[PDB]
Amino acid sequence: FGRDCRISFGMNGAAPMIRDETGLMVPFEGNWIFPLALWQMNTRYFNQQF
Amino acid sequence: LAYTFFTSSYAIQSPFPEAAVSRIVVHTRWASNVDFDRDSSVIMAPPTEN
């Protein structure tokens, strides 16, 4: 993941997705890689979804 | 959409108004901080206002 990490709520039961670095919408599962600065700029939001 | 999705719910300042409709209005020196006033301002109101 990079500076652009937009999150989209899932609707009508679909799982929410977060934008990959290459630009593919992926669900909240598996193994991820974050730079620290990414969490810092979105602490409150991320600390609500994850 | 649940209220947790929107950015305003986290009290985050935005560069732009967060509204259903927004428009552009001319307002001379609406952000200036001058020492001498030239006293020739041109100010309109939003088009919903006459």
How many strands, which pairing sense, and closed or not: the largest β-sheet of chain A?
3 strands, antiparallel
Could you tell me the radius of gyration of chain A in angstroms?
Answer: 11 Å
Structural class of chain A: alpha+beta
Largest sheet strand order of chain A? 1-2-3
The N- to C-terminal Cα distance of chain A equals 15 Å
Quick one: how many beta strands of chain A?
Answer: 3
What percentage of amino acids of chain A are in beta strands? 15-25%
Helix amount of chain A, in percent? 25-40%
Query: Largest chain-chain contact?
Result: A-B, 4 and 5 residues
Pattern of helices and strands of chain A: EEEHH
Question: Count of helices of chain A?
Answer: 2
Oligomer: part of a larger assembly
Task: Describe the global form of chain A.
Answer: globular
Features:
2 chains; 50 residues; alpha+beta; 2 helices; 3 strands; globular
Textual characterization of the structure:
The structure is cut from a larger assembly and holds two copies of chain A (50 residues). In chain A, strands 1-2-3 form a three-stranded antiparallel beta sheet, with no helix packed on it. The two termini of chain A are 15 Å apart. The first copy, chain A, is 26% helix and 16% strand. The first copy, chain A, contains two helices and three strands, in the order E-E-E-H-H. In chain A, strand 1 (7-8) and strand 2 form a beta hairpin. The longest helix of chain A is centred in the last third of the chain and has 7 residues, at 43-49. By secondary structure, the first copy, chain A, is α+β, with helices and mostly antiparallel strands. Chain A has helices spanning 36-41, 43-49; strands spanning 7-8, 17-19, 25-27. The interface between A and B is small, with 4 and 5 residues. It is classed as viral protein/transferase/rna. Keywords: asymmetric, mu2, lambda3, lambda1, virus, VIRAL PROTEIN-TRANSFERASE-RNA complex.
